[PDB]
Design an enzyme around this catalytic site. Sequence first.
Site, short mmCIF file in Angstrom:
data_model
loop_
_atom_site.label_atom_id
_atom_site.label_comp_id
_atom_site.label_asym_id
_atom_site.label_seq_id
_atom_site.Cartn_x
_atom_site.Cartn_y
_atom_site.Cartn_z
N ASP A 1 1.22 4.98 2.19
CA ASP A 1 0.84 5.65 3.43
C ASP A 1 1.19 7.12 3.36
O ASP A 1 2.33 7.47 3.06
CB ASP A 1 1.56 5.02 4.64
CG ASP A 1 1.23 3.54 4.78
OD1 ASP A 1 0.05 3.24 5.02
OD2 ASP A 1 2.14 2.74 4.55
N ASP B 1 -3.50 4.55 2.62
CA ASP B 1 -3.86 5.03 3.94
C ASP B 1 -3.57 6.51 4.04
O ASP B 1 -2.48 6.96 3.68
CB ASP B 1 -3.08 4.27 5.02
CG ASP B 1 -3.49 2.82 5.11
OD1 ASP B 1 -4.66 2.50 4.78
OD2 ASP B 1 -2.66 2.03 5.55
N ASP C 1 0.86 -1.18 0.00
CA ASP C 1 0.00 0.00 0.00
C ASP C 1 0.89 1.23 0.00
O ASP C 1 2.13 1.12 -0.05
CB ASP C 1 -1.00 0.01 1.19
CG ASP C 1 -0.40 0.50 2.51
OD1 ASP C 1 0.84 0.63 2.62
OD2 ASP C 1 -1.20 0.71 3.45
MN MN Z 1 -0.77 1.55 5.07
NA NA Z 2 2.45 0.65 4.11
#
Ligand code: MN
Ligand code: NA
Length: 326
Positions: free
Chosen positions: A195, A250, A193
């Site tokens: 962030d 995120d 992912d």
């Molecule tokens: Mn994350």
């Molecule tokens: Na991450």
Amino acid sequence: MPAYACQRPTPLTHHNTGLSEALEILAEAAGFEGSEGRLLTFCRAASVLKALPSPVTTLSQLQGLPHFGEHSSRVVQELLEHGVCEEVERVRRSERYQTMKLFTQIFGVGVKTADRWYREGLRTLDDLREQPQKLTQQQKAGLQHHQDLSTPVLRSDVDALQQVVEEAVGQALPGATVTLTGGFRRGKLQGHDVDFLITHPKEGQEAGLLPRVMCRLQDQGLILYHQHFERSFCIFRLPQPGSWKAVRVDLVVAPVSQFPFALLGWTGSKLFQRELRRFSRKEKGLWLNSHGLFDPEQKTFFQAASEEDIFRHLGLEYLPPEQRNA
DNA sequence: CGGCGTACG
DNA sequence: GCCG
Ligand SMILES: [Mn+2]
Ligand code: NA
Ligand SMILES: [Cl-]
Ligand SMILES: [Cl-]
Ligand SMILES: [Cl-]
Ligand SMILES: [Cl-]
Ligand code: NA
Ligand code: NA
């Protein structure tokens, strides 16, 4: 070798990769059985090897290293003598491990949910798809997007995502900033992912920011999934040549007073942060989280202006993000 | 033997 | 599973 991972530099790449990977399998397997203590010991032993300056070639090199007892030392001994550890291989091929790994890798599925599905006889993603009555909206999204979410996010993906996040953030609140955190800030070339940490230089202006950001991203057609706050766990639509792919992102907002704590907390690694908080409480009597650092005797919060400040307040040598790869 | 990080959605 |  210090006992806490936050007391020693841990680079991203190191000299004991095979050994650490085997111990991390046993850690992961312990987690699937709910044995948090054994997970921690195997994670810590793996991390110790990552911090060593050269390859372990003989069992005697483990003497005196923290977190190596009978079990972790035997794993290493077998790998050194035979190239393989029978216990590790047994875990790897087990139905329990493979299915718990498959299920917990789904966004919206944790160990408890995976374990209950396992006990119900479920084994494959299609088993889950052929019974959507038992799925949350979050799990439905994680399952629909599972293939894309299993594809590594690359550093080129990150630059494009940061530009679109900054665009939405700038409309939601002029002057707000976007900082890349997580594994990419530690120097990783890939990830699961991306962030981002968002703040504003004027304390209090960040209040209410994240809904405004999310609405603007959603209006641009970039959001495939969002919960709707200060943390958002999104699935973004990332353009690709002639198409696009789903990417987990995120977003977290912090006031500028808390930004050093949030930056530290979101830059990881996960084990580094647990060890740092454990060190803070057990060795220094101070309570650390991603909002601040509390002295429970004086009932005061430490004002930090930088990550450097936080390491100094804890009596630790500063480690840049690239050396927090515990 | 107790402890094992500490939050938010 | 290991530390203190
Ligand atoms: Mn994350
Ligand atoms: Na991450
Ligand atoms: Cl345990
Ligand atoms: Cl598109
Ligand atoms: Cl900082
Ligand atoms: Cl926190
Ligand atoms: Na999951
Ligand atoms: Na814990």
